[PDB]
């Protein structure tokens, strides 16, 4: 039950490594919070038409129920403070994203 990842025009195909970079520093706190976990993981989702970060911070309906659960690989921090690494390991389609309960359908 972690806040949805802001794709920000970074599609993540299943079983295809990808890098997501976001300007806002809010994701820094989220990334630092999950490091303590022995097996850090991150969900991956897809945005809908009419992309808007304001809607992302307002509503969760914007992000498609479809997503790709996977594991966070490694931290780089070469020049920026956010080089999220997303891989497609386990496809998922949330039954009801309003309510986190997720079945790997």
């Amino acid at each position: 039950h972690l806040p949805l990842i802001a794709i920000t025009r970074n599609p993540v195909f299943p079983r295809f490594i990808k890098i997501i970079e976001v300007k806002n520093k809010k994701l820094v706190e989220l990334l630092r919070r999950k490091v303590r976990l022995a097996q850090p993981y991150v969900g991956v989702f897809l945005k809908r038409d009419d992309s808007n970060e304001s809607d992302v911070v307002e509503s969760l309906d914007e992000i498609y129920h479809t997503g790709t659960f996977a594991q966070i690989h490694e931290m780089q921090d070469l020049g920026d403070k956010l080089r999220m690494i997303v891989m497609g390991h386990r496809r998922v389609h949330i039954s009801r994203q309003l309510e986190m309960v997720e079945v790997e359908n």
Partner: protein, 124 residues
């Protein structure tokens, strides 16, 4: 290069043949898009190459005759024309060196140049 909505549709496709065929259709569509992008510049290249081919044919019909189809432009003959137009005049020397410099510039200057036209008028 299918849009995000196309991937959404493929994900909502729950039958394997359906998703595979839809993915193939998206593949052909995006290939058409990218190949059109390339083809525009490739056709610019084709246009330039055709135009230069025709210019080369014009060059062939110009050089093959080597002025045996046309006649000497006499632009180089302007040198001797002016000199004989002046040869008969007992004249000071500074003006001769100025004339020689102008003639050298004429030789250097291209025929169509405005600089060349003003040089021709001044030498006239």
């Amino acid at each position: 290069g299918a849009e995000s909505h196309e991937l959404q549709d493929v994900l909502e496709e729950t039958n394997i043949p359906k998703r595979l065929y839809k993915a193939l259709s998206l593949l052909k569509k995006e290939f058409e898009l990218s190949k059109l992008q390339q083809r525009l510049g490739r056709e610019v290249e084709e246009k330039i190459k055709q135009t230069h081919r025709k210019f080369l044919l014009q060059e062939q019909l110009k050089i093959i005759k080597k002025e045996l189809g046309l006649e000497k432009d006499d632009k180089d003959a302007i040198e001797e024309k002016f000199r004989e137009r002046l040869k008969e005049l007992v004249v000071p020397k500074h003006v001769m060196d100025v004339v020689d410099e102008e003639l050298s510039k004429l030789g250097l200057l291209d025929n169509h140049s405005s600089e060349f036209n003003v040089t021709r008028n001044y030498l006239d």
